[PDB]
Amino acid sequence: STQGLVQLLANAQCHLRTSTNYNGVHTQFNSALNYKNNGTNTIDGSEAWCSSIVDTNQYIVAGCEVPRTFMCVALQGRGDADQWVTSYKIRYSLDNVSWFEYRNGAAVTGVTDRNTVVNHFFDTPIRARSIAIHPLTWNGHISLRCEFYTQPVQSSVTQVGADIYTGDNCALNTGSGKREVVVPVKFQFEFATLPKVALNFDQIDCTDATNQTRIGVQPRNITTKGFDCVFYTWNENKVYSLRADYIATALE
Amino acid sequence: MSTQGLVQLLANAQCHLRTSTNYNGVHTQFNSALNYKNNGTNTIDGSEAWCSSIVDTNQYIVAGCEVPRTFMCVALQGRGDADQWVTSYKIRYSLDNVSWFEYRNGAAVTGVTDRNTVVNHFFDTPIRARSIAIHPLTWNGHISLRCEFYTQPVQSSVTQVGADIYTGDNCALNTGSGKREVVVPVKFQFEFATLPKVALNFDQIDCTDATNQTRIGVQPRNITTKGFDCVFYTWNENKVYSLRADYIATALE
Amino acid sequence: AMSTQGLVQLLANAQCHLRTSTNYNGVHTQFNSALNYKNNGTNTIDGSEAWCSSIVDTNQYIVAGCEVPRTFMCVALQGRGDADQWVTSYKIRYSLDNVSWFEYRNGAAVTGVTDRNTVVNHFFDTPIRARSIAIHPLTWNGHISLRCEFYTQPVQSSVTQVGADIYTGDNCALNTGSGKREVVVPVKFQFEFATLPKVALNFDQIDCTDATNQTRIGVQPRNITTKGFDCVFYTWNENKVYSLRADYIATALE
Ligand SMILES: CC(=O)N[C@H]1[C@H](O[C@@H]2[C@@H](O)[C@H](O)O[C@H](CO)[C@@H]2O)O[C@H](CO)[C@H](O)[C@@H]1O
Ligand SMILES: CC(=O)N[C@H]1[C@H](O[C@@H]2[C@@H](O)[C@H](O)O[C@H](CO)[C@@H]2O)O[C@H](CO)[C@H](O)[C@@H]1O
Ligand SMILES: CC(=O)N[C@H]1[C@H](O[C@@H]2[C@@H](O)[C@H](O)O[C@H](CO)[C@@H]2O)O[C@H](CO)[C@H](O)[C@@H]1O
Ligand SMILES: [Ca+2]
Ligand SMILES: [Ca+2]
Ligand SMILES: [Ca+2]
C-alpha cells in the first residue's frame, strides 16, 4: 500500500519533539514503527514513545525542513505491554507559522492491540513541513510507535548568470556561412551534479538577409564548473551583437 | 507580539539539537523547548529544562538547520521546576557549517533572572545561518535552560530546466496568414509537487519580416504538475521558418 | 583534523537526525555519539562516552539522515571514551531517494578501530551522493559502542522565482521617436528573497520594425533588490518597436 513512498522516521528524515516522556527510556528514540528492543533487560525501556502526563494534551511532532506530501500515517501500539492509542487527531503546518487540523480536528482510528499496524491514508494528501499526532483515546497509557509516508522529494540547485555578450561588431558581423562567437562561462560555484542550462536572448542587434533573421545561442561543453556560450548565425546574415542570460540547474 | 509572523524553530521541530553534556537521561534537550512543562507529581520524568552534566563555561546547546535561515531573535528561559537559570550567554553560528563565528565577537548577551520569565534577545543585525549555539557564560544554581530561536519563514523552490524545444525546420508557421500556432507538448523529467510557473524564452530564431515587421512568440499553455504545451506562434502575414526555446519551470512550497 | 579540512562535520554541526536500533539506556544514546564526545568523568549518572546498543548482535545500527542531498567523503569511527568497548569492523549503507537503499562495497566490511580514542577515517572509494547513511557494526570488542562523524562537501542552497509575461503593452512608447528609448515595468517578486537575487530576463514575444534592415531590441533588469526589479525594455537608433514581452527567473543563494 505504501510502495514507492519514503518512510520518514525509518530514514531519519525528521526531528521528533514530544510533549512529555515517561522517562529517559520511553522517549521518541523508541518511536519508529516496529521498534523492538532487549526483551531480556528492563533497562532499555519501552517498545514505544510513552508520555509522562496521561491526558488529551500530549503529542509527538515530526518536523521536516523541506516540504513533503504526506500520503499516510501508520500507528502501532507498544510492543512490550498492553498500551496503545485507539484514536488521535492530526495537526500540521506548511510554513511553520500557522497550524491546521486534519478533518477540522476529528478523531482518526487508531489501533486495537500491541503490534498490528493501522494505516491511515489522508482524505487528500497533506502538503506540510511539520506534522503531529495528538492521542485522543488510549488503552492503558499513551504509548505508540508510528510512521509517516511521503512522496519522494526532489532537490534542485540553480545558478543564474547575466549578460553574456558577443562584444560590439563581433565576428558574426562579417563573412558568410555558419559562424560562431564563443564566450566561456564559469559558474560562481561548482555544482555537485551535471546541470542543465537554459540560455536565451536579452539583446539582439542584427541585419536581415533577404528579409530573413537568423540568430542563435547555445551552450556547449557543459560541466559542473561552467560551459561555453556559443553565439551563432548562418547563411549571409550579419549580426553586430547578441547578449544572453543563463539559468543552470542541477538535480539531487 | 514581538515575534509575530516568525517561525518558532524548536516548537516546529525544525532543527536537530546537540548538547555538550546532559545531567542525565531526563535532563536532555528533549526538555529544552520554551515553556516546556512536565509531570510535577512524578520525579522520574526529570527537569523542565536542558541541564548540563559539567558545570563550567564550556557548555552549549547547538540547533542545526540544513536550510539556511535568517535568525531574528533568541529567547532564553530558566528551569521550570527548580531555581536554576542562565544569567548571561554568548552566541556562535555558522552558515556553511565549515567556518563558525561569534555574535558580538563573543561578548555576553543578557539572560534571565528567574525560572519562567522569558527574555528575548533580537540580534543587532539578523543572523543568516544554518547552525546556531547558545554558550552559557554565567548562571544561578546550575546550567539549565529552555529556549527558542525565531526565524523568518523560509521558502523552498524546485526548478527544472528543459532545453531546445523546437518547431522543426520549415515549420507550419512558414506558410499562411493570420494567427498560426505550432504546439510541442513538453513533459517535465519529474512531476512537481505543486503547480509550477514557467519561463519559456527564445534561443534560435529563423524568420521572415513582413513589410519590415518581425512578429514571433512562444508561450506555455495548459501548465500542469506534469508538463505543458509549448506554443510557438506568429501572426499577420509573417512567415517563420523555425523557432527554438528553452524553459525554466519552478514550483514553490 | 587536517585530512578532512574544509569538509562539513555533520554531527558536530547538528546537520542530521540520528536514529539508532537500540540504546543501552537513556544515558547511552545517540546524544553521546559525536566524535570526541566527552562527559563528566567524576559522575557516573551521565553515562557513556559513546552511543552503546542494548542488543549485542549484527543487527544494530546508527542512521544519520539529511533532507538535503550531500556528497559524503568520509566516515570517522571512534571507540568508547570511558570503557574498553569499540567497533572493529562495520558496513556502510545509504540512500539518496529514501526509498531504495544500497550497500557500500556490496556489504563488505570496512575496517574500524582498535582502541577507545584513536579515530579511524575511511574515505569512500568514490564519494557517496546520499540523504541518509547508516553504520552497521559487524564485529566489536566488548560491546557495540561508538562515536562517529560523517564529512561532506559544503552544500549550496538556492531559492528561485519565475515570473511570466512582463509586457510593454501594445503600440508602446518604443514605437515612436528616435535614439535610446525605454519603457520601464516595475516587477514585485511574489515573496521577498532573504538575499539579493541574480535575474535572467529574456524575450518571449517580439513585435518590431527594422531600420535599414537592422533589428535593435533589448530587455534588462534595473534596480534589483530583494523585493523586485524594474524591467527595462528598450530600443535605440531609428528603430520602432510595437511591443516586447519577457519572462524572468530570479535566484538567490544561501
Ligand atoms: C542552411 C541555410 O542557410 N538555411 C536557410 C535557408 O537558406 C537558403 C539557402 O540554403 C539556399 O541555398 O538558398 C535559399 C534562397 O535561394 C536560402 O538562402 O533559408 C531558409 C529560409 O527561407 C531558412 O532561413 C534556412 O535557415
Ligand atoms: C493583429 C495584427 O496583426 N496586429 C499588428 C499590426 O498589424 C496591422 C493590421 O492589424 C492592420 O490591419 O493593417 C496594418 C497595416 O496597415 C498592420 O498590418 O501591425 C503592428 C505594427 O505596425 C503590430 O505588428 C501588430 O501586431
Ligand atoms: C549607436 C547605434 O545606434 N549603434 C548601432 C549602429 O548605428 C550606426 C550609427 O552609429 C551611425 O551614426 O550611423 C550609421 C548609419 O549611417 C548606423 O546607424 O548600427 C550598428 C549596425 O551597423 C549597430 O546596430 C549599432 O547598435
Ligand atoms: Ca540580462
Ligand atoms: Ca538552448
Ligand atoms: Ca511567457
Short-list B181, B161, B236, B170, CA closest to B207: B170
CA distance A210 to B241: 14
Ligand minimally distant from the alpha carbon of residue A198: 5
For the domain made up of A1-153, the CATH class stated in words is mainly beta
Residues of chain A contacting residue B13, judged by C-beta atoms under 8 Å apart: 14-17, 61-63, 130
CA distance B124 to B104: 9
> What are the φ/ψ torsions at residue B201 (nearest 5 degrees)?
-130, 155
What is the nearest CA distance from C28 to chain A, expressed in angstroms?
10
Q: Nearest by CB to C14, from B25, B64, B219: name it.
A: B64
User: Separation of C164 CA from ligand 4 center, angstroms?
Assistant: 15
Residues of chain C contacting residue B25, judged by C-beta atoms under 8 Å apart: 25-27, 29, 47
- Pocket (CB within 6 angstroms of ligand 2): B 213, 215, 235-236; C 207, 242
List Cα–Cα distances, B166 to A46, A122, C242, in angstroms: 62, 41, 26
CA distance B29 to B20: 10
Short-list A96, A247, C34, A239, CA closest to B250: A247
Residue A227, C-alpha cell as written in the block: 560551459
Radius of gyration over every alpha carbon of chain A, rounded to an integer in angstroms: 29
What residue ranges in B141-253 does DSSP mark as E strands? 144-151, 157-166, 180-187, 197-208, 213-221, 227-234, 239-252
How many Cβ contacts (< 8 angstroms) between chains B and C?
A: 162
User: Separation of C162 CA from ligand 6 center, angstroms?
Assistant: 10
Three-class SS of A189-200: CCCCCCCEEEEE
Using the Cα atoms of residue A72, residue B63, residue B52 and residue C142 in order, give the sign of their dihedral. positive
**If you measure CA to CA, which chain C residue comes closest to A192?**
C71
By what technique were these coordinates determined?
A: X-ray
The amino acid at B46: G
> What are the φ/ψ torsions at residue C244 (nearest 5 degrees)?
-140, 145
Say yes or no: C237 contacts chain A, CB-CB below 8 A: no
CB-CB under 8 Å, A52 with B39: yes
DSSP B27-68: SSGGG-BTT----TT-GGG--SSEE-SS-STT--EEEEEEEE
Q: Are strands C228-235 and C181-188 parallel, antiparallel or unpaired?
A: antiparallel
CB-CB under 8 Å, A24 with B25: yes
Q: Nearest by CB to A69, from B160, B164, B193: name it.
A: B193
What is the nearest CA distance from C108 to chain B, expressed in angstroms?
31
> What are the φ/ψ torsions at residue C30 (nearest 5 degrees)?
-60, -15
DSSP C128-154: EEEEEEEEEEEEEESS-EEEEEEEEPP
Say yes or no: A86 contacts chain B, CB-CB below 8 A: no
Q: How many residues appear in chain B?
A: 253
CA distance B134 to B142: 15
**Listed residues: CB within 5 A of ion ligand 5:** B 163-164, 203, 246
Nearest CA to ligand 1 atom 24: B206
Is the CATH code 2.60.120.260 the one for domain B1-154?
A: yes
CB-CB under 8 Å, B212 with C210: yes
> What are the φ/ψ torsions at residue A210 (nearest 5 degrees)?
45, 55
CA distance C133 to C61: 10
Given a contact as 3+ CB pairs under 8 Å, which chains touch C? A, B
The amino acid at C224: I
The three-state secondary structure class of C46 is helix
How many Cβ contacts (< 8 angstroms) between chains A and B?
A: 161
Q: Vertex B159, ends B158 and B162: CA angle to 5°?
A: 150
CA distance C217 to C235: 5
Q: HSE on the CB side for C112, CA within 13 Å? A: 31
Is the CATH code 1.25.40.10 the one for domain A154-252?
A: no
Given a contact as 3+ CB pairs under 8 Å, which chains touch A? B, C
Short-list C56, C112, C66, C120, CA closest to C88: C112
Three-class SS of C176-235: CCCCCEEEEEEEECCCCCCCCCEEEEEEEEEEEECECCEEEEEEEEECCCCCEEEEEEEE
C1-155: CATH superfamily: Galactose-binding domain-like (2.60.120.260)
DSSP B212-231: TEEEEEEEEES--SSEEEEE
Cell 488529551 belongs to A56
Say yes or no: C97 contacts chain B, CB-CB below 8 A: no
For the domain made up of C156-254, the CATH class stated in words is mainly beta
Domain ranges within chain C, ordered by starting residue: 1-155, 156-254
List Cα–Cα distances, A77 to A50, A210, C64, in angstroms: 10, 80, 26
User: Separation of B207 CA from ligand 1 center, angstroms?
Assistant: 11
Is the CATH code 3.30.2090.10 the one for domain B155-253?
A: no
Say yes or no: C63 contacts chain B, CB-CB below 8 A: no
| Break positions in chain B: residue before each gap, C to N over 2.5 angstroms | none
Instruction: Please tell me what resolution, in angstroms, this structure has.
Output: 1.6
CA distance C99 to C240: 57
CB-CB under 8 Å, C13 with B64: yes
CA distance A91 to B134: 30
What is the nearest CA distance from A53 to chain B, expressed in angstroms?
6
Cβ-based neighbour number of residue C110 at 10 Å: 18
Q: How many residues appear in chain A?
A: 252
> What are the φ/ψ torsions at residue C136 (nearest 5 degrees)?
-115, 100
